[PDB]
Write a protein that binds this ligand. Structure first.
Ligand SMILES: Nc1[nH]c(=O)nc2c1ncn2[C@H]1C[C@H](O)[C@@H](COP(=O)(O)OP(=O)(O)OP(=O)(O)O)O1
Ligand code: NA
Ligand code: NA
Ligand code: NA
Length: 153
């Protein structure tokens, strides 16, 4: 089995809307996150990436899922720890690399999100926790995947 590198993904989910970020430099909407750094907990890495990438701070996050991504032709797996929060501080900030935008929860832009999000983000919305795995050929094609609702992440 390949080695895996730790990542975070943060969904700011309010009762009627979700905040996503568009990659500018591209075209795909995603939650906020990035690589976990040496010596920080995964949750602290998620908080740090949210602040670095969007400007938002949060006191805490709730872990809702974990998804492992495999890409054909790449040696490492991405082990993505997925967090949610409903409570924010500040306004999101656009950078050279990311543009944040709110979407109503009847306008989730699935066609412009990673394809896997169509499978797990419905579970997140139902207050469910999940473990997933997706194997991609390039950015658009899933060759294999597993998804399971779990009681504990
Ligand atoms: N298939 C997928 N579905 C999804 O919803 N999010 C994915 C995904 N594949 C990767 N991601 C997320 C995980 C993580 O939040 C982000 C990938 O991390 P990045 O490459 O953005 O890390 P960094 O911000 O550390 O990188 P740099 O800014 O290049 O240093 O994209
Ligand atoms: Na980042
Ligand atoms: Na980073
Ligand atoms: Na990032």
């Amino acid at each position: 089995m390949k080695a895996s590198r730790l990542y975070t993904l943060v969904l700011v989910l309010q009762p009627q809307r979700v905040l996503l970020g568009m990659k500018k430099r591209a075209g795909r909407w995603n939650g906020f996150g990035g690589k976990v750094q040496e010596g920080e907990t995964i949750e602290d890495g998620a908080r740090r990436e949210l602040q670095e990438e969007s400007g938002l701070t949060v006191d805490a996050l709730h872990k809702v899922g974990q998804i492992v991504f495999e890409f054909v032709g790449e040696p490492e797996l991405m082990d993505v720890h997925v967090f949610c929060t409903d409570s924010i501080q500040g306004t999101p900030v656009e950078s050279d690399e990311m543009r944040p935008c709110w979407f109503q929860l009847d306008q989730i832009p699935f066609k412009d999100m990673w394809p896997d999000d169509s499978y797990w983000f419905p579970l997140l919305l139902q207050k469910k926790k999940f473990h997933g795995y997706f194997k991609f050929q390039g950015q658009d094609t899933i060759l294999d995947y597993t998804l399971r609702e779990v009681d504990t992440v």
